[PDB]
Structure 1
Amino acid sequence: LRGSCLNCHMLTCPRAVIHLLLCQLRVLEVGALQAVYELERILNRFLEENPDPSASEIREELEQYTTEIVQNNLLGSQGAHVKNVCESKSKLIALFWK
């Protein structure tokens, strides 16, 4: 509630960050962990190419890769009990909370 708003029910975080975390979290559910640098590489390339709030729902390539990384290794809900996966999943959510 210290990040939200009264009349509009959205938040004060910029849209690039909350797209980056939304794409990184569904990659770490599969437990890819090779793409959590790939997503920040491609969104820095996109935001360098055309910075805009007009990407309201998703960017096309961030959402396209986080669909391809879910489709590849489709049964990857079971390969995500590793230390390194829960490491990044605790670290990124703590970085978004702080």
Structure 2
Amino acid sequence: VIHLLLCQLRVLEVGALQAVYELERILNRFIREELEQYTTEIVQNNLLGSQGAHVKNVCESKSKLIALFWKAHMNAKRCPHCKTGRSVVRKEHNSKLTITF
């Protein structure tokens, strides 16, 4: 997810909008080298479009991508590399963040 979203953002920054689903399908059909080749090819062959990226249909896509990220992939989870890395930050009312043991 990290690398997929990174590459999708790299392509959105220049306006390429088919590259989004193309990257996602390249991923599912398959990580950094697999995605970065296509993403660099897009960003190179489709530059000159940093000024033509501030359009509706390019802002909706970035909005949706980042919103889905913050909404679905930032929940507390058992840690990958060390299985016991949930030092659960759990914030009370603003001005209060409490880590556990």
The 1-side partners of 2:36 and 2:17 are apart by: 16
Instruction: Name which one, 1 or 2, has greater alpha-carbon Rg.
Output: 2
Greater RCO structure (CA 8 Å; 6+ sep): 1
RMSD: 0.9
* Runs of 4 or more consecutive aligned structure 1 residues displaced over 3 Å after TM superposition: none
TM-score, with length taken from structure 2: 0.67
The unaligned stretches of length 5 or more in structure 2 are: 72-101
2:77 aligns to what?
A: none
Which secondary structure does the structure 2 equivalent of 1:36 belong to? helix
2:89 aligns to what?
A: none
The 1-side partners of 2:23 and 2:12 are apart by: 12
2:43 aligns to what?
A: 70
Identical columns (%):
97
Count the aligned residue pairs. 71
CA drift at 1:71 = 0.3
The 2-side partners of 1:81 and 1:24 are apart by: 16
2:64 aligns to what?
A: 91
TM-score, with length taken from structure 1: 0.69
Match of 1:61 among 27, 34, 47: 34
Match of 1:28 among 1, 6, 12: 12
The unaligned stretches of length 5 or more in structure 1 are: 1-16, 47-54
The 2-side partners of 1:38 and 1:73 are apart by: 14
